Subunit: 129 residues, 3 copies
């Protein structure tokens, strides 16, 4: 899967890397995805460039919001996805990201929509499972 | 929904926010979405990093292109999608984004593809309608 | 189609433009898309704010990784997508992008999910076919 992590620039770089580690450890845990199946783009913005309010659920976020957008193969179950949301959030708490400051989304495609390198579509050819 | 707004450096931080406020007012007034259901990433670029042509339609854009990318759950009609594009562009004309310089895309997922915080899928748990 | 090219800041801007010309030309070739159908967002990152491993396929990359994300309307075949992958990569090879440093994702939507300018949905109205 391809992960876009968009966060604010008050966070340290050590922590940005640790957030990226945590998001990835968590996807390996629940998806049982290979450990080197790791593709992430970390982007840091001024605090003012990311707006994430509460959707009227009755909480506030710090300005240090982490938005995590997972692009992944269709196939995963509703509960697998629920387990993904939980594992990521709990993976991030000991690392300094409060559960109120985590926003996750998934958007889906198919195995034939991926090229990991060399102009090749590895899921189509069978090189990747 | 989650909105990626990509625009150019020549625009002031005040216009950047006005832009985002307009994209969000448009979405509230056409989709009837909660006002606090606001999730946006603003990324400014050097003008040369955004390349948006006319698709052969015979018109000029300024260097100041504003690409707006809407990630939202499936459900909306063709017609509602037309009204969204219309309202976004009309919201933005009075702030000083020309109609030639706005580009909009929509990408869809399910309600089970969303976690607004705390590791929970609020559409799955019913914490959100 | 909307193309997001995420690459590394160490690349020289001329090269950044060349990488974008070559992705554009490659899609014109395989997809027979209008040449002025060119909508692309280049984002330069610090090298280590891109993480791209190998999915355990057994290969290394340099840090000058180039991730391309094609947002295109549905309807291309499995084989056409493979031709896309292969052509993007081959075009990028003479421009100082190793086959090992490329990553590609396609994510699909519908023709009614696009506004090319002016608040209008050109595929829906019929201004574009």
């Amino acid at each position: 899967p391809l992960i876009r992590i968009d966060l604010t620039s008050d966070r340290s770089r050590e922590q940005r890397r640790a957030i990226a580690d945590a998001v990835h450890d968590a996807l390996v845990e629940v998806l049982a995805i290979p450990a080197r199946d790791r593709f992430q783009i970390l982007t840091a913005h001024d605090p003012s460039d990311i707006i994430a309010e509460d959707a009227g659920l009755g909480f506030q976020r710090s300005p240090s919001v982490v938005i995590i957008h997972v692009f992944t193969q269709a196939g995963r179950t509703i509960e697998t996805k629920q387990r993904v949301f939980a594992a990521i959030t709990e993976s991030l708490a000991p690392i300094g990201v409060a559960g109120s400051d985590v926003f996750i989304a998934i958007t889906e495609n198919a195995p034939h929509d991926w090229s990991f390198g060399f102009g090749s579509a590895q899921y189509v050819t069978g090189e990747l499972a």
